[PDB]
Amino acid sequence: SGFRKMAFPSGKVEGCMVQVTCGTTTLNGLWLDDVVYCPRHVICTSEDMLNPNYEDLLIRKSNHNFLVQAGNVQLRVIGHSMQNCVLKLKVDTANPKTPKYKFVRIQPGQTFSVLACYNGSPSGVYQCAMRPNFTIKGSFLNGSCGSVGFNIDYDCVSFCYMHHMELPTGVHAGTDLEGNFYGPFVDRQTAQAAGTDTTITVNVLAWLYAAVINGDRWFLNRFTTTLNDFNLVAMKYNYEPLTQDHVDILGPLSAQTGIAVLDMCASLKELLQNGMNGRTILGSALLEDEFTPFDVVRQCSGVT
Amino acid sequence: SGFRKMAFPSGKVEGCMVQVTCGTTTLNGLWLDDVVYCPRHVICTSEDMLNPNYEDLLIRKSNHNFLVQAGNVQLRVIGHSMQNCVLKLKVDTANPKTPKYKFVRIQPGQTFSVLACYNGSPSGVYQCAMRPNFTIKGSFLNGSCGSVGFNIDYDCVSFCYMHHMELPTGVHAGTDLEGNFYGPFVDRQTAQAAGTDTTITVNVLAWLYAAVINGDRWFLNRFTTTLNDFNLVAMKYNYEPLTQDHVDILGPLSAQTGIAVLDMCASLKELLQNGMNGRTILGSALLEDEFTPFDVVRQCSGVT
Numbered sequence: 376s377g378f379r380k381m382a383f384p385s386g387k388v389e390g391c392m393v394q395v396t397c398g399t400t401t402l403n404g405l406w407l408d409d410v411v412y413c414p415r416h417v418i419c420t421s422e423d424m425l426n427p428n429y430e431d432l433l434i435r436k437s438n439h440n441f442l443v444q445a446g447n448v449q450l451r452v453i454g455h456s457m458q459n460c461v462l463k464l465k466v467d468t469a470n471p472k473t474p475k476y477k478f479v480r481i482q483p484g485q486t487f488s489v490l491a492c493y494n495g496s497p498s499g500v501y502q503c504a505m506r507p508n509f510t511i512k513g514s515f516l517n518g519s520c521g522s523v524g525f526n527i528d529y530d531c532v533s534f535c536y537m538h539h540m541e542l543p544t545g546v547h548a549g550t551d552l553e554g555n556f557y558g559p560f561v562d563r564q565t566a567q568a569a570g571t572d573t574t575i576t577v578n579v580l581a582w583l584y585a586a587v588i589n590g591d592r593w594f595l596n597r598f599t600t601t602l603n604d605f606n607l608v609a610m611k612y613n614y615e616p617l618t619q620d621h622v623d624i625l626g627p628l629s630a631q632t633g634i635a636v637l638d639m640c641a642s643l644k645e646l647l648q649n650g651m652n653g654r655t656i657l658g659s660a661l662l663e664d665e666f667t668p669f670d671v672v673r674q675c676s677g678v679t
Numbered sequence: 680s681g682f683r684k685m686a687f688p689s690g691k692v693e694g695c696m697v698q699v700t701c702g703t704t705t706l707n708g709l710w711l712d713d714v715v716y717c718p719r720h721v722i723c724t725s726e727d728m729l730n731p732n733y734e735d736l737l738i739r740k741s742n743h744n745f746l747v748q749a750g751n752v753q754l755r756v757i758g759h760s761m762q763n764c765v766l767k768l769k770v771d772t773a774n775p776k777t778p779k780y781k782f783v784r785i786q787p788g789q790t791f792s793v794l795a796c797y798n799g800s801p802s803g804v805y806q807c808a809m810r811p812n813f814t815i816k817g818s819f820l821n822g823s824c825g826s827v828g829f830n831i832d833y834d835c836v837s838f839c840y841m842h843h844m845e846l847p848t849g850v851h852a853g854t855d856l857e858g859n860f861y862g863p864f865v866d867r868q869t870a871q872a873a874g875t876d877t878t879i880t881v882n883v884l885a886w887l888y889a890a891v892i893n894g895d896r897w898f899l900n901r902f903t904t905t906l907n908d909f910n911l912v913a914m915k916y917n918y919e920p921l922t923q924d925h926v927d928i929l930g931p932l933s934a935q936t937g938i939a940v941l942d943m944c945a946s947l948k949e950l951l952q953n954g955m956n957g958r959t960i961l962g963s964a965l966l967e968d969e970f971t972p973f974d975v976v977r978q979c980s981g982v983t
């Protein structure tokens with residue numbers, strides 16, 4: 376009973392957080408095995424930020440210039456390299472708390488947990504999604520760079536995001552753990568506007584199924600629709616077009632509830648056209664799109 | 680930038696979760712030092728549930744009937760006792776991962792993180808609040824009993840909740856770590872209806888301050904009000920009455936933003952009387968009440 380915006384238990388990732396300081400800048404790093412991963416902008420000053428040449432700035436840095444601290448103890452840096460927008464600091468000690476892990480590059484619509492950190496110390500955990508415009512709507516202040524996003528499959532942590540920047544509009548941009556930014560963002564203090572933040576249709580439908588499973592059924596109607604008809608409505612409301620791949624992934628939710636995917640689309644179409652009329656669904660007065668079909672199945676079944 | 684429903688990092692609590700089985704019932708337990716805390720209804724069958732005499736049922740149980748497993752290894756139970764609605768199983772081994780901790784009994788309006796668990800294994804973490812009717816709106820399935828609620832002050836975990844039951848309305852009830860239920864609930868499968876779930880006014884105001892700090896300012900108006908005038912409106916809308924204690928706790932938010940507490944009350948009064956008009960505040964189309972003034976300061980300042 377009940378349905379909450381739930382994050383993964385953060386302990387496995389907490390054991391990886393370290394502090395990285397270069398010159399006068401301090402941010403977070405991720406220590407896995409004998410490598411510490413952090414945003415390459417740790418080497419920049421408040422003058423380099425406008426148009427930094429990272430390869431040139433890195434020439435002036437040696438292993439001893441990167442101060443890496445895990446708790447109250449210092450790690451010895453024995454190598455460093457730049458991979459895309461991240462730095463990989465080789466240390467002389469493998470992290471004894473290294474969990475089983477993978478580096479994954481997620482697609483828009485996919486959700487993940489963020490362990491926000493400051494000075495290598497975890498402050499909180501929340502759930503968010505890679506938006507269709509490749510931004511994330513996080514909660515990050517100065518010092519949070521290097522905080523990571525991840526998913527967990529039983530004992531394996533799949534790291535998908537590293538925090539690098541805040542756009543002038545208060546939304547967030549970052550990279551995968553290979554240092555490649557999601558979307559067109561660059562690690563520079565320049566004009567970077569985000570595209571249309573469309574709604575993740577498949578996630579809204581998954582959340583409507585979660586609502587039905589939890590007893591909120593007022594929005595179920597006597598109608599059905601087609602993918603093409605539904606998509607005309609989705610385009611009008613800045614919703615992502617629904618594909619047969621999305622219909623297929625909603626199969627287990629349709630099977631559990633007995634509500635055909637296209638019938639749920641017709642309920643969503645009416646909600647888009649008529650609004651909620653001051654009513655709520657799972658404690659929300661808007662259509663929630665940061666639960667994937669997999670998240671709904673996981674939470675509704677109790678996967679650990 | 681950004682404001683999220685953020686939970687505490689769960690690692691310190693993950694290290695305390697164990698599985699407790701008695702007869703054919705399995706739920707979660709909390710292992711701190713050499714004691715494992717769990718709901719006393721672990722001793723009940725699906726016949727005892729209607730009207731259990733716990734003292735009588737416990738007479739038929741010995742130390743060896745409580746199976747306690749921490750990961751894949753079994754703990755030896757050398758004592759057991761009942762304290763209110765919880766059982767305390769003394770084990771022969773102190774939990775090596777015991778964090779610094781306290782047991783606190785929270786008041787309605789206070790928020791905490793929940794680490795939902797099944798079979799002693801953590802499934803997720805979310806944030807919630809002790810409602811004014813002493814229920815919590817969680818996400819719990821069968822097997823989640825014994826999952827705990829907590830707050831963290833730097834290195835000390837303050838445990839405030841242990842999950843015991845779901846009411847027929849899908850809301851949740853439980854105890855503090857001394858085994859005393861919040862509210863009038865009893866650990867019995869009987870008719871237990873919840874009282875009015877009023878809105879936590881001081882938390883809504885704190886969240887309006889968080890919105891202003893994060894740039895969502897459309898709701899700020901040219902009006903002010905008094906505590907008595909505001910409270911007439913709060914009563915009409917099933918909001919908790921605001922006191923000078925609440926005004927005082929909002930002082931730091933008023934000081935940071937320069938918006939007098941009574942001016943923010945007047946903005947909230949207009950939002951109650953006029954609605955949101957299809958607009959949003961911090962990504963919500965309703966007034967959020969599960970962030971305390973302390974939560975807002977913490978998240979807006981980056982406390983670790």
Ligand SMILES: Cc1ccncc1NC(=O)CCc1cccc(Cl)c1
Nearest residue numbers: 416419424515516517540541562563
């Ligand atoms: C201030 C803040 C808040 C939240 N998340 C992240 C941040 N920080 C930033 O955006 C840093 C911007 C930057 C880019 C490239 C070089 C340099 Cl020196 C700085």
Ligand SMILES: Cc1ccncc1NC(=O)CCc1cccc(Cl)c1
Nearest residue numbers: 720723728819820821844845866867
């Ligand atoms: C099924 C569920 C779902 C979520 N949270 C909790 C639960 N479980 C319950 O409410 C258990 C009710 C109970 C009370 C006293 C004795 C016995 Cl045998 C059972």
